[PDB]
Design a protein around this nucleic acid. Structure first.
Lengths: 228, 50, 93
RNA sequence: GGCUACGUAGCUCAGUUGGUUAGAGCACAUCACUCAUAAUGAUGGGGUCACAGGUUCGAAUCCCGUCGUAGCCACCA
RNA sequence: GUAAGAGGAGGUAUAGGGAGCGACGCUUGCCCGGUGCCGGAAGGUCAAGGGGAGGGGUGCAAGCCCCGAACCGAAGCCCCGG
RNA sequence: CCGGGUGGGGGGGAGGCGCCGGUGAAAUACCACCCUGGCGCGGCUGGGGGCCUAACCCUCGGAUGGGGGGACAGCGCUUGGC
RNA sequence: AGAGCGCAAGGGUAGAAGGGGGCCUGACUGCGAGGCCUGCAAGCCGAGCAGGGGCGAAAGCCGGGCCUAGUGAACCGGUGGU
């Protein structure tokens, strides 16, 4: 073995110096992915915001013109009343302030927590050590700041992606879902660039946009002339 | 005097001015309080620059 | 001295480096005001090409050596003969 | 002003390209060996690594704000 | 002396220029802090120069002009010792 | 880092892995950027060693030349400094 | 009224300037009669009028500060702006 055998076939499914933009990738890379059945896209976006630049880890929460195709369950913590709101959307045992210990031990059916401003404090004091940095805590901007957050739970069932910078700009946007024709792929790509600028930080120099790679689950990527 | 610093106040929605003074030692951050604009009527005014 | 091709001779006084101190843009200006006086020499060089039978030197300017090479080629066409350094060098130009 | 470079215990300096378990010699207290002091040894007193957020699950180990400190430049209506 | 050159010298380290005291005799101690001065293939800082990210202005536009970042940039002062 | 990693070929064969779980801040087949420091190669542009001779600069019983240095030295413009 | 009346002094002060809380931001803009003071230039006094506000039910006061020190013509240029 090596790069896999498939990815030698894909050594020729990239011609390691191309672009194919949003469009030629929409179609020809509606094909280019070959593995299982998700072909993520992972818009892998690197710019120049620095691992810190004092304070610039971005945040930006995107949901696309339609949706991704997943599930989060959300669990949530919401002093009885708040539940009500979120309790017509996606919800797994919203539990006023009781499902924090069964997270803290017993059962793990979740992603995010919707929190509130109130229990932010609460839910920000306990499992704040892993959920944050790994990406699950309140982090009062990651779908966790009130009761418009059940409506933002529908912003979640639509999508989430938290624009960030890490140490590589990185960002990794996952769609395409095996059956997204050329359309939905093109569309959600353009969309992610839109929102990318919609929540971008300033104060740092270099070159915004570039390493854009439409990198599927296990396949091709080699940029897209990262914009148009 | 300087080191206790002096500042001018500026409106919102673009421009409108006056000529006042500050003081740092008291836990003061964004100096913000009422005044009047040249054009229109009563507005806030935020602390600004030199 | 002076170039024997296109003249060219010295230049003084407010020809210059001046010092000045000068202005420009630091705020009120670089330091702003700034002013004083000086002097400026010109170039030359010395090139020795034979041409015809004898030898000749040249008190050439800086950017004008090809001019006297062109002189070599120009003097070819004429009748140069015998012992005449600066004399034949003269009729040249 | 631009620029850098340090600023840690009373004294004096390490460690400083993280990750533990934050110091060492002189100063002082108790003892110890000592025929007796010195020398050495074994403990203890004191850090709040100048000041605050941001990165790390975890910076005394980075960014930035703020002064205190020195070299250079250069701005002094 | 602006030069060409002049002396120094048709001399050549037992020689030529400068400084201090001043025959001969006994002797010339201690401090490199500042300063001058001998030295050092690191460095702090600083000039024109180089490079050109990012940008401005202008015109259908091609284009033209202007601003300048990273780093590259000497002696000098600081720095290390004598 | 003595813990082991990565890379190459000989042999022999249908077995070899991966996953919540189990363990911590973080999981470990696996596709993509980047940081890190290092190797190399292309662009851009300096450092330093050594050779060469004919510009250039001296020098030899009339030199057409030979002999010494040589792109340094000297000179023009210019940079900043003392 | 001998205390406090920010800080020197003097005048002044409870029929409050002091001291408590609520509210607020008139430490307004455009002016400004008529004065104090006066070699000039400066400095110092204020109703009133328009705006549009803060307090009070109001009557009303509010264009900083109990009062007199806490300051710097002009030229130069930075600054946001028409």
């Amino acid at each position: 073995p090596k790069h896999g055998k498939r990815y030698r076939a894909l050594l020729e499914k990239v011609d390691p110096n191309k672009v194919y933009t949003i469009d030629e990738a929409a179609r020809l890379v509606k094909e280019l992915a070959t593995a299982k059945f998700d072909e993520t896209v992972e818009v892998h976006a690197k710019l120049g915001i620095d691992p810190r630049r004092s304070d610039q880890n971005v945040r930006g929460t995107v949901s696309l013109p339609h949706g991704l195709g997943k599930q989060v369950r959300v669990l949530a913590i919401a002093k009885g009343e708040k539940i009500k709101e979120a309790e017509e959307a996606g919800a797994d045992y919203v539990g006023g302030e009781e499902i924090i210990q069964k997270i803290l031990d017993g059962w793990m059916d979740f992603d995010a927590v919707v929190a509130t401003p109130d229990v932010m404090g609460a839910v920000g004091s306990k499992l704040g050590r892993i959920l944050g940095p790994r990406g699950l805590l309140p982090n009062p901007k990651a779908g966790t700041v009130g009761f418009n957050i059940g409506e933002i739970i529908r912003e979640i069932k639509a999508g989430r992606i938290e624009f960030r910078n890490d140490k590589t700009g990185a960002i990794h946007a996952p769609v395409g879902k095996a059956s997204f024709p050329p359309e939905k792929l093109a569309d959600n790509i353009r969309a992610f660039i839109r929102a990318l600028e919609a929540h971008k930080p300033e104060g740092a120099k270099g070159t915004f946009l570039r390493s854009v790679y439409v990198t599927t689950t296990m396949g091709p990527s080699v940029r897209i002339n990262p914009h148009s | 005097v300087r080191i206790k610093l002096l500042l001018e106040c500026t409106e919102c929605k673009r421009r409108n001015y006056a000529t006042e003074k500050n003081k740092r030692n008291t836990p003061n951050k964004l100096e913000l309080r009422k005044y009047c604009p040249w054009c229109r009527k009563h507005t806030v005014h935020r602390e600004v620059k030199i | 001295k002076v170039c024997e091709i296109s003249g060219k001779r010295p230049i003084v006084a407010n020809s210059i480096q001046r010092r000045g101190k000068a202005k420009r843009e630091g705020g009120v200006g670089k330091k702003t005001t700034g002013i004083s006086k000086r002097r400026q020499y010109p170039n030359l060089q010395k090139v020795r090409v034979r041409v015809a039978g004898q030898e000749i030197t040249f008190r050439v300017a800086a950017s004008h050596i090809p001019k006297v090479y062109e002189l070599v080629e120009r003097a070819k066409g004429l009748k140069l003969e015998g012992l005449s350094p600066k004399e034949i060098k003269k009729e040249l130009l």
